């Protein structure tokens with residue numbers, strides 16, 4: 781159903797616009813997002829919750845090509861992490 | 871120091887690109903992001919952690935104008951919410 785993408789990116793302006801822009805240009809909806817800075821660095825962590833799609837693998841390719849994306853992978857996180865976060869903020 | 875912006879937006883493709891694009895186009899960095907869909911609706915809640923700035927007023931003005939942004943407000947969330955989230959996901 782859904783899948784979680786984990787990105788390590790540079791914490792500088794415009795990075796999230798590039799990443800989400802790849803989905804926007806494909807009418808691909810992003811269901812959940814978490815972005816947290818990494819202490820003592822110039823980078824941030826991004827979690828993207830998206831519907832599992834045949835187009836996903838070619839998109840991971842496009843994300844990795846972005847200069848400000850250091851790494852992009854799948855399903856390393858708690859698959860229900862956004863449900864647990866929502867319990868405390870919704 | 872920093873402030874948290876709360877947005878209610880439609881859960882449609884491209885919406886996060888529009889919101890962050892406003893910051894990107896002004897070289898305004900977004901430090902933390904949380905996006906959660908709202909149960910039983912076509913809307914999502916976005917929390918944006920950004921440096922408190924006089925530029926924010928105009929920025930908030932532009933965010934509210936976006937058709938897909940239903941509402942946008944300041945200082946209604948726990949200012950340290952992204953520190954608390956990091957305790958459990960970093």
Ligand SMILES: CC(C)[C@H](N)C(=O)O
Nearest residue numbers: 792793794795796900
């Ligand atoms: C990491 C990301 C959210 C970046 N800080 C940006 O403003 O686009």
Ligand SMILES: CC(C)[C@H](N)C(=O)O
Nearest residue numbers: 810882883884885886
């Ligand atoms: C709410 C937001 C993340 C929207 N679903 C988007 O894909 O841009």
